Amino acid sequence: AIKRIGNHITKSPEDKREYRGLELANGIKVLLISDPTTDKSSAALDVHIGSLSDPPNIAGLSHFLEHMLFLGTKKYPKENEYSQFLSEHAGSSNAFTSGEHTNYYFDVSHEHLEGALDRFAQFFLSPLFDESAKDREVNAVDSEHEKNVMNDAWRLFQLEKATGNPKHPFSKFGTGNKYTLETRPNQEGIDVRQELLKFHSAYYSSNLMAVVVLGRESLDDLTNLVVKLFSEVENKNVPLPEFPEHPFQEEHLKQLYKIVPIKDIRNLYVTFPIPDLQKYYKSNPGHYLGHLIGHEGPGSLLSELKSKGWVNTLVGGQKEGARGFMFFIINVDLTEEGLLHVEDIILHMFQYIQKLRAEGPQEWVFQELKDLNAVAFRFKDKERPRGYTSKIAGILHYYPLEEVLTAEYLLEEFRPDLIEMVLDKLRPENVRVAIVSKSFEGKTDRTEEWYGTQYKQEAIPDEVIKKWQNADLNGKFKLPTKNEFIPTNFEILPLEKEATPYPALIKDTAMSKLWFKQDDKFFLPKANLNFEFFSPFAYVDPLHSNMAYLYLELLKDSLNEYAYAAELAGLSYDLQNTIYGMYLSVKGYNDKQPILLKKIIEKMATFEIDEKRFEIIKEAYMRSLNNFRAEQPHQHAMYYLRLLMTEVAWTKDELKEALDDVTLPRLKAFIPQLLSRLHIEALLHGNITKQAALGIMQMVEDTLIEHAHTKPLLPSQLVRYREVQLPDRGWFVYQQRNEVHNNSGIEIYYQTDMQSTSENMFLELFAQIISEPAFNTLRTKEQLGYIVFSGPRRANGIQGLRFIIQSEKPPHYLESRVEAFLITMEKSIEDMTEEAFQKHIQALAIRRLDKPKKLSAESAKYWGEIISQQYNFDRDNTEVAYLKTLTKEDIIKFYKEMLAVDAPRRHKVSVHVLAREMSQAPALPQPEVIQNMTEFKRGLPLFPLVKPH
């Protein structure tokens, strides 16, 4: 068909992408995306056809068809010719048939609209369905079924599909194999390929297409480009695949299934066939319901059961069904005290329902959630366009030409009748039970044919059901109050006359040190926040470290019950242990930032403790401690990395004797002594005011002085720790025999100098020239082992060079391999040509040069300068200036005294981490063994700090 209607689409005015939606006369829904600013011009072709829409003779006929629809035209019957086009134009095409939709989609390079369109549109007129392509692709569908044997999600998906009403055609199968798709149909005389021709012609080409192209030229260009060529499809009017009856017809209510998964998981899946609410889309009942389900507040059943500890995690929520019916699922991860009390958890669900009964419908939670999601959905920033097309094409089928964007995301009216329907629908009479545990071995014997999972019928006795339905008697269930707190104050602040290109020290006292520049590349309502804590006590004891660690644990554990909705309102934060103390960082929108900021400050400022919760947290991390004693050799090697590069780091054994004497009054008295004196440096960024930032800083410091009169720190005590000096040619090493792993680990480290002008580009460029030829040679060409890494390592504000490499070798022999690579680089000094140099410096420059894509991207790096006290935020420009400065003669200079073996300024580090049981040899000096690590690092020097900027 050729027909067009359309207008100015309600395009959510933060976006500038011009839009036009329509449908052709033959049942082809067409959206037209005109983005003249794009590079990758995309396209999509979705048909609303389920995997259950196959004729009953061939299960998965649509799956194998769309796996075979690409092959052979009358213009180009070659196999990958359209794929050769997309090979010419950097394209990644993909397609599927879902349970509702048979979709096809791709993109093109920049402008090859009619090129890809003509290489694409010939699938209709002559579908060849080549024989060897069929015989290979049926093995691909068998492999698709086989990789569906292991993914538990689609196993339980198909278990939901087939174990309903077996006569009703919801019980058909989706993927297919060799046997049920090839072996049995053609032996009935019903040949496959002629049925493929019939199933694409009379059935596919009839109706239900929902397509979209992403053009970029103009509106009328794409209009007469694509509306013209897709007259090739014409309507044959198939009946609509719809199941107006639910399948769960009375063999299904209160019916158990003990399911064996692949992975050892503990899960109860509770199913509700619920009516079609596609017409009820202006309310969004069900996902507002699931908002109420996984909600965490006062009287939260989540708060109840995790306070009881009975749950790992849960979700309840609406499942999109078919055109006739819909579903509703409740999915929960369990504990043993959850496992023994599942039915009571269901009873708790019933008490939650009874809580809903005591409140009925409430306008205000819907109103605030609605307004928040509305302002959010306008202020959703941008979008990965590919896949977005598939999404909108997924809902172009269900909505008219303007009701697609703000479809479910713009609610309209309060519908208490739908609320009382679903409260009336969600009943114990309505429950379908699916229990997923790996401990279901043996007693479960009626095994799945397609996948081999074991299930039982074994229905619920009526004592428990009757016991459920009369006893609706709730306990600690209480109302969660709203915490909205006005995010409408999002007006973008224009930058003042004080326009400096970086966050500046705008406020400095003995207590204050304030740093803030706002948004330039993004112009966002969010703001991101970075906050310094120092205490001396955080480096002094294993005992008090465990204390403060678990202190932060139970602490951030606590207000998360409050902070669920607020961070659910898109306001994230961070409490993180450091060796300096804690670490604070907050990110997010300007809804409630100084307010909730102050709430957090006061809350962590004064907090109370429960003894049982104390001891359970203690024991939980106690059992976490001795778990660590068998890490991976590269992971535990990274532990020795952090262990052999410091002033002191207390070991897990140091921690393990230390927990033997821990009491709650000890740290409970110690905490204000612990927080007795601090300095806080604040890094700030985003849509805020300089003078308001001054007031917020004064606020938080005065708040803490109000709490416990935390006095300012001293410059005479703000100390940092150094990296140790080798005896200028003495390279030292020792070994660590592992227990479990039979791989022998080893990792190298070096010390050039500080992050001066030269040494940064030295280490990075050198790291890059041991990236590609070494990845070419040692890991690829030699295959010494699987775990092979080569890369940087920044310790104590000093860079260096690590090799996270693990195999089963004599490590001295592997060192000899390393030394062979050093001779390789010796030859490669002159062999770095002009071109290797130029490609090499420009690739590291592109590695180096990158504008921010997030407001937090540069902030972590700035924070790295902060924790190293650097603040030259254009030292990367200095890095570019030195990248303009390296010569080939420098790497002679860099090799002789720094990199060689006779190198008089040699700073080499290595450590063996042995196993569980473990062409030119230079005159290496024999290193020592390192037994007393205390006496090892006891007598050696340290390194200089900064002549300042």
Output the DSSP codes for 665-734. HHHHHHHHHHTSB----EEEEES--HHHHHHHHHHHHHHHHHHH--B---TTT-----PPPP-SS-----
Q: Are 841 and 883 in contact (CB under 8 A)?
A: yes
Instruction: Give dist(CA 903, CA 397) in Å, integer.
Output: 72
Beta bridge partners of 575: 584
Reference 400, options 14, 5, 3, 99; nearest CA is 5
Which residue is it, tokens 């019950």? 561
Rounded CA separation 793/678 (Å): 30
705 phi-psi bin (left φ>0, alpha ψ -120 to 50, beta other): alpha
Q: Is 94 exposed, middle or buried (0-12, 13-18, 19+ CB in 10 A)?
A: exposed
Grouping H, G, I as helix, E, B as strand and the rest as coil, residue 744 is strand
Give Cα 180 to chain centroid, integer Å. Answer: 37
Helix (H) or strand (E) holding 136: helix 131-150
Neighbours of 382 (CB within 10 A): 8
Question: How far apart are the C-alpha atoms of 77 and 783, rounded to whole Å?
Answer: 43
State how far the alpha carbon of 221 is from the alpha carbons of 15, 25, 119, in Å. 22, 21, 18
Taking the CB of residue 85, how many other CB atoms lie within 10 A of it? Answer: 21
Q: Give the integer Cα–Cα distance in Å for 72 and 130.
A: 7
Among 288, 281, 264, CA closest to 336: 264
Q: Report the binding-site residues.
A: 63, 67, 144, 291-297, 314-318, 384, 850-856
Contact in structure between 476 and 299 (CB atoms under 8 Å): yes
- Residue 566, helix vs strand vs coil: helix
Is the Cβ–Cβ distance between 465 and 428 less than 8 Å? yes
Are the CB atoms for 46 and 211 separated by under 8 Å?
yes
- Residues serving a catalytic function are 66
Of 268, 287, 459, 417, nearest to 347 (Cα)? Answer: 268
Please tell me the chain's helix, strand, coil percentages from 3-state DSSP, rounded to the nearest 5: 40, 15, 45
| Joined tokens for residue 420 | 């009382």
Residue that the structure tokens 């479990």 belong to: 740
3-class DSSP string for 896-939 = HCCCCCCCCCCCEEEEEEECCCCCCCCCCCCCCCCCCHHHHHHC
Half-sphere exposure of 374 (CA within 13 A, CB side): 11
Question: Distance between CA 522 and CA 858 in Å, rounded?
Answer: 12
Q: Do 298 and 479 form a contact (C-beta atoms < 8 A)? A: yes
Distance of alpha carbon 668 from alpha carbon 618, whole angstroms: 14
Say if residue 819 is exposed, middle or buried (CB neighbours under 10 Å; 0-12, 13-18, 19+).
middle
In the annotated binding site for Zn(2+), the residues are 63, 67, 144
The answer to whether residues 213 and 222 touch, using CB atoms and an 8 Å cutoff, is yes
Distance CA 133, CA 213 (A): 28
- Alpha carbons 633 and 745: distance in angstroms, whole number: 6
Other beta carbons within 10 Å of 836? 14
Q: What is the 3-state secondary structure (H, E, C) of 372-400?
A: HHHHHHHCCCCCCHHHHHHHHHHHHCCCC
CB 261 within 8 A of CB 438: yes
Gyration radius of the chain's alpha carbons: 33
> Exposed (0-12), middle (13-18) or buried (19+): which is 25, by Cβ within 10 Å?
exposed
Eight-class DSSP state of 532 = -
Which SS3 state, helix, strand or coil, does residue 948 take?
coil
Q: Which residues have C-beta within 8 Å of that of residue 810, sequence separation ≥ 6?
A: 744, 918
**Closest to 755 (Cα-Cα) out of 784, 728, 791, 792:** 792
Residue whose entry in the numeric block shows the structure tokens 């020795």: 640
CA geometry: angle 763, 768, 772, nearest 5 deg:
150
- For tokens 């310094």, name the residue: 532
Task: Read off the DSSP letter of residue 780.
Answer: I
- Close Cβ partners of 477 (under 8 Å, ≥ 6 residues apart): 299, 301, 351, 352, 354, 355, 358
- Closest by CA to 107, choosing from 48, 39, 46, 47, is 39
Phi, psi of 809 (to 5 degrees): -135, 160
DSSP 201: I
Exposed / middle / buried, residue 887 (Cβ in 10 Å: 0-12, 13-18, 19+): exposed
Please state, in angstroms and rounded to a whole number, the distance separating the CA atoms of residues 281 and 407: 8
What are the structure tokens assigned to 353, written together? 């329902």
Distance, C-alpha 638 to centroid of its chain: 24
Task: Name the β-bridge partners of 330.
Answer: 270, 316
Q: Identify the residue whose tokens are 């027909």.
A: 3
The rounded distance, in Å, linking the Cα atoms of 359 and 202 is 53
The CA distances from residue 532 to 153, 238, 479, 815, in Å, are 43, 66, 37, 42
What DSSP line would sit under 284-325, residue for residue? -HHHHHHHHHS--STT-HHHHHHHTT-EEEEEEEEEP--SSE
Find all residues with CB under 8 Å of 733, minimum gap 6, and list them.
Answer: 909, 910, 911, 912, 927, 928, 930
Q: How many CB atoms lie within 10 A of CB 438?
A: 13
Cα(first)–Cα(last) distance of the chain, in Å? Answer: 71
Place of tokens 């924070």: 863
After which residues, if any, is the chain broken (C to N > 2.5 Å)? 918
Nearest C-alpha neighbor of 774 from the set 828, 839, 721: 828
Closest C-alpha to 538, from 585, 576, 586: 576
**Length in residues, the chain:** 949
* Amino acid occupying residue 435: I
Q: How far, CA to CA in Å, does 418 sit from each of 250, 358, 423, 924? A: 23, 17, 8, 82
Is-contact 297 561, C-beta < 8 A?
yes
The token duo for 930 is 């390192």
- Helical residues (DSSP H) of 334-384, grouped into ranges: 336-339, 342-359, 363-378
Amino acid at position 587, single letter: K
Residue 671 phi/psi, 5-degree rounding, is: -55, -50
3-state SS assignment for residue 771: coil
Name the binding residues for ATP: 384, 850-856
d(CA 34, CA 39): 12
Q: Which residues pair with 508 in a beta bridge?
A: 513
Closest CA to 822 of 747, 922, 907: 922
The reported resolution of this PDB entry, expressed in Å, is 6.5
Determined by cryo-EM
- Decide: residue 263, CB within 10 A, 0-12 exposed, 13-18 middle, 19+ buried: exposed
